[PDB]
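Known limitations

Structure tokens in this collection are predictions and should be treated as such. Users comparing against experimental data should check residue numbering before alignment. To illustrate the layout, the record for bfr218_protein is reproduced below. The input appears on top and the generated tokens appear beneath it.
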Amino acid sequence: MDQLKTIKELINQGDIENALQALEEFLQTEPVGKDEAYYLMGNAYRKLGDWQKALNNYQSAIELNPDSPALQARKMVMDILNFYNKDMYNQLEHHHHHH
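Generated tokens:
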């Protein structure tokens, strides 16, 4: 069943640490369902405020399934980062760098 639901509940509550913990476990027991897991992981980090960890986890989901919502989610975070600063952004991707 959707055991991730419990994690999704934790993420909503703010219990991201336990969520991430269970997600780490889930990664090791799911060959394919990790794409939803990484999405949740990145979403958890995106709730914390760590955009870099969010990007990496969203990216990991994208790398598994380019059909996942993690694409739009990573772009969501990218938009917010683009609003903040490009100091580290130009290092990640030298693209969309317009002046």
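For this record: DSSP finds six helices and no strands in the chain. The chain has one domain: 1-99. Please report discrepancies through the issue tracker.
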